[PDB]
């Protein structure tokens, strides 16, 4: 077997590594994307997935927008099959220091919880959105109470920070 999780906690598995490669070998079904909610797809995740889908993501997005409402931090929306057997879920995390940063985040995990098949997803609202990893995790673990989930990060420091979460 090839890409192995570097930590495992309940049915959540944590992977480090590049995106395309993860998608490629982990073969998911739902790729959760971290999107800033009026839906320009910039930075490590989104600018990533968009490119991988040949930019279909963005094409569906402008489309989406004409007959549907911008996504409200604390909400996510699903684009079914942006590729064949590849669904992208557009998660809008809260910014740092809006209110119930807490609650909002958890709904996002909660909504993610809800999907079908293999999920690959990054940690919401971490990175540019400047929310502590501790929390996005804290929330993650709480919410997706029971289902297999595939979380990925990019950095080392990230990877580590996660390990010490479980060690203490
Ligand atoms: Cl909703």
């Amino acid at each position: 077997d090839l890409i192995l999780p570097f930590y495992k906690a309940g049915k959540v598995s944590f992977y480090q590594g590049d995106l395309d490669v993860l998608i490629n070998f982990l073969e998911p079904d739902v790729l959760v994307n971290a999107a800033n909610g009026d839906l320009r797809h910039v930075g490590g995740v989104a600018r990533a997935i968009d490119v991988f889908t040949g930019g279909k993501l963005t094409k569906r997005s402008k489309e989406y927008l004409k007959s549907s409402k911008a996504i409200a931090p604390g909400n996510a929306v699903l684009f079914e099959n942006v590729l064949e057997h590849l669904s992208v879920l557009n998660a809008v995390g809260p910014r740092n220091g809006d209110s119930r940063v807490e609650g909002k985040l958890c709904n996002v995990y909660k909504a993610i919880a809800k999907c079908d098949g293999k999920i690959l997803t990054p940690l919401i609202s971490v990175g540019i959105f400047k929310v502590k990893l501790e929390v996005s995790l804290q929330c993650l673990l709480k919410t997706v109470t029971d289902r297999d989930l595939n979380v990925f990060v990019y950095t080392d420091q990230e990877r580590v920070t996660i390990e010490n979460f479980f060690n203490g």
Side-chain angles (χ1 to χ4, degrees), residues 69 71-72 74-77 111:
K69 163 212 72 194
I71 302 202
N75 289 120
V77 154

Side-chain angles (χ1 to χ4, degrees), residues 11-13 15 26 118-122 148-152:
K11 300 173 188 190
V12 194
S13 310
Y15 286 86
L26 289 182
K118 223 167 173 173
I119 322 182
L120 189 45
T121 173
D148 311 58
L149 187 52
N150 296 267
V151 193
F152 69 99

Side-chain angles (χ1 to χ4, degrees), residues 38-139:
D38 51 4
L39 279 216
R40 320 208 217 352
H41 296 304
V42 284
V45 173
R47 153 198 70 249
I49 300 178
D50 200 29
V51 170
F52 185 87
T53 42
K56 274 236 179 43
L57 172 63
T58 287
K59 203 207 156 52
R60 305 278 73 83
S61 306
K62 306 158 169 191
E63 285 196 26
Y64 172 83
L65 279 187
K66 315 167 64 179
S67 77
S68 303
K69 163 212 72 194
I71 302 202
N75 289 120
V77 154
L78 201 78
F79 283 11
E80 304 224 83
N81 282 320
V82 177
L83 283 196
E84 183 63 48
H85 277 72
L86 184 61
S87 272
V88 159
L89 183 137
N90 291 291
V92 172
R95 212 154 236 69
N96 163 52
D98 322 8
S99 34
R100 222 179 339 106
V101 199
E102 199 80 325
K104 291 171 158 163
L105 223 148
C106 259
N107 291 324
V108 186
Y109 282 121
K110 195 184 145 188
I112 276 176
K114 280 219 175 58
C115 314
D116 317 289
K118 223 167 173 173
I119 322 182
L120 189 45
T121 173
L123 285 190
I124 288 312
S125 293
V126 162
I128 37 124
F129 257 152
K130 316 166 175 166
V131 193
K132 293 262 240 176
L133 204 158
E134 226 78 8
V135 211
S136 188
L137 190 33
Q138 198 22 47
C139 231

